[model samples]
Target: DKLLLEEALQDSPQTRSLLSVFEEDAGTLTDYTNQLLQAMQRVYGAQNEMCLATQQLSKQLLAYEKQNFALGKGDEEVISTLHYFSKVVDELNLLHTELAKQLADTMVLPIIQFREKDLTEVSTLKDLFGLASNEHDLSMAKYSRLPKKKENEKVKTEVGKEVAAARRKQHLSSLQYYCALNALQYRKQMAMMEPMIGFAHGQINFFKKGAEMFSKRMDSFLSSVADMVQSIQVELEAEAEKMRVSQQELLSVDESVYTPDSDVAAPQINRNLIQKAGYLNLRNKTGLVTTTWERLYFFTQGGNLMCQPRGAVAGGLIQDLDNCSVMAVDCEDRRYCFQITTPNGKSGIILQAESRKENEEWICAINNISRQIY
Candidate 1:
């Protein structure tokens, strides 16, 4: 079943027509081979995914022991069972890995070889044949266009020899191209079926090995796991029954006896002077222009307004109350707001309280301390 017919003379109409047929067939074959390669590579990639998936599943099964569940009364049995399943899954993963290797070596590589070696040769051969054909046609055209009236015998013979050599080169290249197309016809059959056979055999061997490895081992281990599961279920039911009884017994008792009040009194504030201590919104200009009022713990201590922010030790003094004037002001169009002007008169420190009463109390306390300090 060879492709090229009879090895006829170079540059004949009949031979060229036959070559055209083979070339068209090869073009179709190349396209088809690319599609087949894509399919085989997809199968190979899926096999690889299974290997990784099984590895993850095996690791997940073994992680049960380290979970540290709160009520892990019967977990040792489950842990041992899960550990065994992890080993089984690891064994299966090994099988999957082996299958992937076999699929790569046998299924995927054979088609790739056909594509890279056989199919590639035909395309390169076509390019080379085209180049040689063009060279031969040019040489014939040069010789045919030479002047007959001129005494150019030597040049005529040289050009004729050149045409002869070009024809020979073209014929050689065509022969090589035709042969590659013929080989590709035979290669197509094996390339299509060989990978499928490899895929089938790999799957069959994987299943057979899996069964043989786990047949007896699974039977005994699963029987023991059945007993363990039943026992654990019974124990859990018993513990649940006791829990219900404990709930009933707990509900029947007087709850007040269990809730005794602490005898410790609240800490007394001893500031050695009349002082104010509570949360107040303090005006702070964080950036150059924008002002934000932040809630801070403000207290009057030792004639100084101490400002305490959240999560800090003893607060630093904001302004001394000795020569400060407290006045209620409508600042930024808000109520319960007050301002304290220091003796330096650079600018007034503004403070806001939660209620009108608290604002008045702070103003009175500040003025009293201000008068007493003089």
Candidate 2:
């Protein structure tokens, strides 16, 4: 729809209404194009990532020979097969790289140019037109507010001149704004079609090249590879069957044979042992007089006394058992409490066990570990 330059000067309600419709359409297109750009960018990025992934895959296929397995028997076929796969993957990588480049140039880049050059220019022109229109309206208001009684005739003339100048500026801005909107309508169809067509073309070329390379050239090698894979699966199945029979023979033997005899005493305790592990109530002093008791999981790992919070995978080292001593403490109002302090007595933590037996057990365990470390 054409917005006439003469109608812009009149600034008629019907013309303004048509202009509003054009503005709304432009705004919607701007939003749609932005979203379309984001989608195109995502596809381009995924294509790039696939290119990188295929390159890595090609390298990975070739990397099998460098593993240096201890049992290197029957590996010649595997190595040769992997080398062929690596070559195929490298070829695919080239195709993917070419596709990514094509998509970037043909699809993403053109859309970006349209957004930056055309859509952005239209928006900026719209803003400029708005500012100019506002300026003209404000000047007209000033001209109308002046005294019609003609107390200041010179000021009236100056204000009238200012209103005319403002109108001229607004008229020029509206002309350019209308032209940009008109050009946008003409460009919209091709702007929408070009990038998607480019994307389709890039995909078509990729598939065409892939079919040509793999279908005709790779059939013989791939057939041999299929036979090799079939034989490997057959051998694996036979080995699994042999293991099943051996497992059944072992299962038929008496379970009592592995059970410990009552005449044999239990092994003696060793130093650096994780002898005791359980939850303990730890006194955490948060303020000068505010001490809160938190239930935390405590355990000894070698010479380290570890404290683990709930829902945590590993424990934090509370104190090195090698550098600390644990002793039973008599808190006047608390039971089953123990105090562990650093050797220099600079820091200490008070812990309460769930029972008297556990409290005593932890104290002995910590002391035993610390003594062995000493």
Candidate 3:
């Protein structure tokens, strides 16, 4: 406003008319700046709320681990997958918090500065300029209204001194007022440009940090997922191999040793055998044996290694084989040898079957019944 009313500027109607446009623009800025700060505050509040919401969501996802869930065969995958998701939410929470901080510091803070600092300075200067201008105009009016220099030297000199003092006071006030407005132009430039530059800078840093964190975890996550996939494939192929070996053993079994004695019919030499194999007990306790299709009851000289009682000779307690290791077949000797480690961690108990065919059948059949016991 004081720009157009300066020392040497002409006060014509057209000059005043041009000054009014600048005056209106100043008023418009004052009004709009308040509104802009208010709007920016609303946006800042929402960003803060969004940041807090994401934090809660991240914690909630972690809390899933403490919830009740049904256990199943695939629970391993489900648990691991959800744990990873929680970590993802945690990282995303970081992004939201950073964005929120950037908005408040860069976007909202600058506008508020322009309003509270720059625009408020202008308002203060406006009042000072008005007072200064009014004083200057009143001093001129008072001087103009004074009578011409009087004939008396003392009165005329005193009157001239009074006019000079008034002009000096007006000049000081106008100078102060003009200086403030000029400074405002520089402040205005900062108010206009600083916030924009800071806004862009804050956002650039936000994304840079966010992308860095995301990329940091990407390689580890992808590597683990790929490794798990390969591990699952390998396990499947190995299990299939076991199944095929078991099937081959069953197909190669001989019916001759397992044949019924038709000559000694009835109770003489009964024939209810499905599979039969002869094995000798290494500890001489039992295994040199006979039991059953219906009776394992082994055929030997001094003792039938009651085959049932001697897996590690645990046949009597066979139903309770939970602590026992199943028979492990090894072909170390010229014949077929199979051994089992005891539940007590001892492995001295080994058995020898009469033939390779019988050895295979022993293990396959032992494994078959072992499943049901468990």
Q: Sorted on TM-score, highest at the top, how do the candidates line up?
A: 1, 2, 3
* Model 1 alpha-carbon drift over 4 Å, by segment: 1-6, 66-75, 245-374
- Which sequence of candidate numbers ranks them by lDDT, best first? 2, 1, 3
| TM-score of candidate 3 to 2 decimals | 0.47
Q: Would you list the C-alpha lDDT of every candidate in the order shown?
A: 0.81, 0.84, 0.60
lDDT of 3 by residue, 1-374 (tens): 44644553224556546545655677887787778778877876876787778778767766666667675534566568667767776777767677778778877888887777767776676676567657666756765666764557676667667766765665565456456556766776777677668667776876887788779568788688778889989999999999999999987988764663223223332222324445354433334463212223232221112345333443432222433344655543334566655447664355665544455555555444334343
| TM-score of every candidate | 0.63, 0.62, 0.47
Superposed by TM-score, candidate 1 places the C-alpha of residue 98 at a distance from the truth, in angstroms, of 1.3
C-alpha positional error of residue 346 in candidate 2 after TM-score superposition, expressed in Å: 57
- What is the C-alpha lDDT profile of model 2 across 1-374, one tens digit per residue? 67776665848889889999999999999999999999998988998898888899878887888777769844989889888888888999889888999989999988899899999999999999999999999998898888877568788889999999999998999999999999888788888888889989998989999899988557887888899899989999999999999999988978654453212223333334456788888887789978889999887776787888999689586767547777999764898899988978876888997655566667877866777753
The residue pairs found clashing in candidate 1 are none
Task: List ranges where model 2 is wrong by over 4 Å.
Answer: 151-153, 232-374
Q: What value does the lDDT take at residue 65 in candidate 3?
A: 65
